[PDB]
């Protein structure tokens with residue numbers, strides 16, 4: 301399938317070169333997979349989600365996304381226009397308040413929730429969790445992410461936005477999950493992207509158009525935007541049968557575009573997520 305006039309990041313993940321604007325992908329499109337978006341919520345009524353999104357858990361007075369961040373990230377995973385995996389099922393877990401803030405204890409509870417809740421969902425092709433959040437190093441936060449991964453969920457986490465080594469942030473620094481840095485449309489490391497040995501992969505993160513609350517759209521930047529590209533890619537590849545939740549991060553690294561990003565510090569991987577789709 302070909303989506304013309306796609307957001308640059310979608311075109312990038314199906315291309316061997318920057319500077320194109322059509323997204324190419326197998327029509328299976330993540331059907332039969334599920335992606336949990338652990339964030340500020342999801343505006344599931346947005347027409348872009350086509351009934352495929354739902355809130356399953358909140359720790360606050362509402363499950364609605366009063367911020368926009370979680371809706372944007374969910375749109376990059378799986379919205380019809382802005383999403384990588386256009387037929388996946390999206391499940392929202394609201395661990396962040398409407399200002400985008402949340403306590404680590406709530407975030408940990410949300411991760412353990414997903415590890416169990418997947419057993420209440422129909423995801424025959426596999427389960428992914430996208431975590432566009434983080435803070436300072438916490439062994440307990442890292443352990444929660446490791447448990448979620450161990451339970452059979454492909455965990456993708458944002459590297460962070462400090463232009464610093466991600467070893468000092470969680471869950472970014474957990475070795476067993478997929479830690480995602482951000483790139484721009486010219487294949488440069490995004491100016492804010494964290495780096496370091498703990499990164500596994502880069503995805504599009506600067507000037508990313510996606511869904512927003514109020515049935516709207518907007519372009520924003522962050523490792524939060526790169527992470528759902530990778531989460532959606534994992535769901536797409538799992539539906540194709542090319543990999544599994546346990547192996548998807550490594551498979552994405554194996555099959556990435558290699559050596560194409562600029563301003564990658566010595567010792568950080570130079571790997572850009574790529575779907576290797578041939579029409």
Ligand SMILES: N=C(N)NOCC[C@H](N)C(=O)O
Nearest residue numbers: 314315324325576577578579
């Ligand atoms: N991945 C390799 N080696 N070839 O695929 C070509 C890309 C194809 N134009 C697409 O539909 O994206």
